[PDB]
């Protein structure tokens, strides 16, 4: 999608892995804010919103919560208190044809700069104030968006490249999504401190013949003590017997 008609995708209700994006060398122009880069997998969020737009090189600094340029203020304005953070990737060769190409459009003329996270698609041509054009292109009345010519050989920061912006917005509702985390191998016959899907304790985790229902995941003993737990990785039920603590 173009910058002014920036495409939005909701990736919520789904676990996404953030580490692979960091290990990518192509997505080198990584400048984002708020949550720590290592802390993406650590935290959970209610929503996962992705915005996408191609722009020139010099516009990397222009589009940010702190810095706002004319193209940044209007086409797509990041929130000042930006909880999500931006990813920028250089894609000059794929986007740009020989001697430039003409497929993307940027919008820069309007009376009012858009509020944060506002999409405007209207092609109504601005009349430059008092002079009414009533929908005809003239010296005062000009088309809101101008054709975007892009090539790596061009000048200071005119190289075209793609930008993807991740916004979390976890405040409203329970955090349905989480980053991948806490994967560890299994050991059976040894007193060990276990954490099986949030179940905290210490004991000997042995193989069990008795089975839960496909519904039920945990299991308690009489007097409300944990007795067996189904293994989340591979669906089988392992019984628990805490290791010996008899006196001497």
């Amino acid at each position: 999608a173009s910058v002014y008609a920036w495409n939005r995708k909701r990736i919520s209700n789904c676990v996404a892995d953030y580490s692979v994006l960091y290990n990518s060398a192509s997505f080198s122009t990584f400048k984002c804010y708020g949550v720590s880069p290592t802390k993406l997998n650590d935290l959970c969020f209610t929503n996962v919103y992705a915005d996408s737009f191609v722009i020139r090189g010099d516009e990397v600094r222009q589009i940010a919560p702190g810095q706002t340029g004319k193209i940044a203020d209007y086409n797509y304005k990041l929130p000042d208190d930006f909880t999500g953070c931006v990813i920028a990737w250089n894609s000059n060769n794929l986007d740009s044809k020989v001697g430039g190409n003409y497929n993307y459009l940027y919008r820069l003329f309007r009376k009012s700069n858009l509020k944060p996270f506002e999409r405007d698609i209207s092609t109504e041509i601005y009349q430059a104030g008092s002079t009414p054009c009533n929908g005809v292109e003239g010296f005062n009345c000009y088309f809101p968006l101008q054709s975007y010519g892009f090539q790596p050989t061009n000048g200071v920061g005119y190289q075209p490249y793609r930008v993807v912006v991740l916004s979390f917005e976890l405040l409203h509702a329970p955090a349905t999504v989480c980053g991948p985390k806490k994967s560890t191998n299994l050991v059976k016959n040894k007193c060990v401190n276990f954490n099986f899907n949030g179940l905290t304790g210490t004991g000997v985790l042995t193989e069990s013949n008795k089975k839960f229902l496909p519904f039920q995941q945990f299991g308690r003993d009489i007097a409300d003590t944990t007795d067996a737990v189904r293994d989340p990785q591979t669906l089988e039920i392992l019984d628990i017997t805490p290791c010996s603590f008899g006196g001497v």
Partner: antibody, heavy 112, light 111 residues
Amino acid sequence: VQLQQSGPELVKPGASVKISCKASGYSFTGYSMNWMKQSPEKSLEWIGEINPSTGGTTDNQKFKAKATLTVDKSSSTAYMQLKSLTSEDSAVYYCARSRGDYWGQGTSVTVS
Amino acid sequence: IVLTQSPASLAVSLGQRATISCRASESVEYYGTSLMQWYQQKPGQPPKVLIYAASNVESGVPARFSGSGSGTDFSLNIHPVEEDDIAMYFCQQSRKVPWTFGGGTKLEIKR
């Protein structure tokens, strides 16, 4: 898009002959088919502005005179009828879309 | 508005930058934005436009041309002046009703 314009004129003072600008590939609905004046010197100025969709015209107040700017969208052409003339007003008149990204070939107005 | 344009004849060699300036009668900054227009005309050719407004540039116009200004002071800048960059360059206004161009700004090949 191609602009056609007609044509060579031999008008005498006191008369006025309507100049035609055939639009061809013009959208004729959102590009003010503006009119400007080029003389046998540099001396450029903007003659008038028209709205193909609306119909109202904005004209320079210095020489409002009796220039008739009509959006004849049935033929998709504008028409210069600059009523009342003089030997001084002998210059080429150009018709161009919007600001003038693509002009017309121009007509030789020879008021003598 | 009456726009008078300073030096009206500059000589330019290949690849050499030059500035030909335009001073208006008053500030063109109405509505919070300038409304000057810049046109080039080869001898015997339909004069194309170089700028949308004070700063922008029409599509299909090479980026080697540029220029800007404020109020009643505007100017041009073309670092890569080539053979094609020899024409008559006019400046217009769009705030007050009498939209008027300028005089002459002849560019000639330096030798």
